[PDB]
Design a protein around this ligand. Sequence first.
Ligand SMILES: COc1ccc(N(Cc2cc(Cl)cs2)C(=O)Cc2cncc3ccccc23)cc1
Ligand SMILES: COc1ccc(N(Cc2cc(Cl)cs2)C(=O)Cc2cncc3ccccc23)cc1
Lengths: 306, 305
Amino acid sequence: SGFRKMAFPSGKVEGCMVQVTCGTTTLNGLWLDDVVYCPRHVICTSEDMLNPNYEDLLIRKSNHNFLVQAGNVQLRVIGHSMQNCVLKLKVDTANPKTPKYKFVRIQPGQTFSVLACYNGSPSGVYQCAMRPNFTIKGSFLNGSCGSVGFNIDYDCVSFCYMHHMELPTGVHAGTDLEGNFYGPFVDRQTAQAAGTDTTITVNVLAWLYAAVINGDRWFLNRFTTTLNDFNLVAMKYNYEPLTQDHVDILGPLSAQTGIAVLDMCASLKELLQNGMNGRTILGSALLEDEFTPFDVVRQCSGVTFQ
Amino acid sequence: SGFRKMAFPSGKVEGCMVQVTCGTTTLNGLWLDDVVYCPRHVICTSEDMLNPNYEDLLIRKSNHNFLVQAGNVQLRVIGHSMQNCVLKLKVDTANPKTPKYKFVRIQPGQTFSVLACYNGSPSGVYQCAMRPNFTIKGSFLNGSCGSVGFNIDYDCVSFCYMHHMELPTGVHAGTDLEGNFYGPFVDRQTAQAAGTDTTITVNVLAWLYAAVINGDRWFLNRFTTTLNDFNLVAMKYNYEPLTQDHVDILGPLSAQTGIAVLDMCASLKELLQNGMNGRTILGSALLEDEFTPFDVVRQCSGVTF
Ligand SMILES: COc1ccc(N(Cc2cc(Cl)cs2)C(=O)Cc2cncc3ccccc23)cc1
Ligand SMILES: COc1ccc(N(Cc2cc(Cl)cs2)C(=O)Cc2cncc3ccccc23)cc1
């Protein structure tokens, strides 16, 4: 029993983290096969970030301007290209610890484990959710850039996030491993703001199923609802629309608990309308939205990674 | 900036996890050098668990009754002893992935990472505190037994916890790696209950210092308190007494923020009195007590391994 913010084991990703230096700028890189992936802003000084021309800045750098350290063993850069906002450093050595992996771009609502790194060394691991405003609430200090976010889907590490920036609100913004930013953000120091955020409805329902599995059932009611009627109430309270796809993804949790998705929807509708009445769910006073349906199943069914 | 419940990277511990089978019982073992450590209840059946004599159960076992698997590799048991509530299986091979390690016993309030394992394979990693009542609020299912809790310091793993049981409240009980239970618990299926839990006051204060470091001061006030008046108030909310040792341990955070420990104690007193009035502190609607003072410094100063 019990329910915790639970990260994927970090072993396979720890094996892939390196230091990248270009000038007095040092940050983290991801070493997979004979390529190191890192933020393109490694080629920038703090002043350069005000109005960078990345084409011009890269056209001036050569292979030997980029110093990569893998533990305390130097890799030779034998090529460099830019894909969107990531630098790809082609190196002389394939990473022997390269796991089975893909690059995945995630949807808002999806969670991932962050291996927070400084100077190519891991500091720790935690769970994040891609907010509907395309920011993450992370723990990132200067030098954290190039730290990655990942899921393990069966036997495959899926890399979904690379850390780039901290916004003035203190929330974090980054790219997929193809250098495509999540959200309307740019790698220049200019006025940029997190948009108004919404609650991830499918994840709140996932977490109410977690509560039922852990014996916290007080919020279940005899009422039902239609998808349409649920969404009319949800949208009043700044909750993301629930689609039929969301309903189907919640099918396994519904089957395991014997509580219909629309019955759980009716329970949530009353929670939003009435509040908690100074009660808690899984020892939280607020409705939690940073657990996916799969996160609940993985923790509550003891799914393992080998 | 930002502050998050952060586990240690699990890689060095993943390298030590194996499956241990005795009869129809399978659980997790820790493989360090040529020894595998596991809960001694691996030699029990479900009926055995009410009043087991582990000396009598163990003397009946041969080396070959213990099946230790590390991935696809069968490890050969060449010896066994019992130390308190852990079994030590001597195997023919030293774990090549063995890290630098120590065995430590932690105090209530200290935190560690759990690598939750089933059949010798990892499910996930989370951060935990030894509660004042010597339980942990974990996430563990049947087959989780032998999962370990640890801290990393430089490149040394200190193992402080081995998982043995779940209590009726759903909290979890376990031993150090010398097989001594945290708390008054025993490896028997007899009725045992967690003592009344209390909040870890020094950790809540550490976490308020974290919130200040992260640029949030809304909860501060103009007031101070004596240690004695703080403890008289805090105990009415089932908070642990704050000792002068706790106050000294909060010294570095006090110095970094310029907020005296007893002034932060005054802030906490008001927070218990008023609640958050629809606000949050580091994204939390409750007062968090599973960050130690060292955890705040480590995460706010960017310590690596
Ligand atoms: C060349 O040197 C720099 C590179 C990046 C930064 N910024 C600002 C920007 C990044 C982007 Cl992309 C556009 S502006 C960051 O947000 C980096 C950053 C990250 N995560 C925690 C941070 C914490 C403190 C300070 C910076 C942090 C600043 C300087
Ligand atoms: C020989 O087979 C068994 C061995 C141990 C268990 N128990 C009950 C007891 C353990 C101890 Cl030591 C005394 S009673 C557990 O608590 C294991 C356990 C662990 N963590 C989550 C658990 C969740 C559900 C059920 C059991 C859990 C039961 C059977």
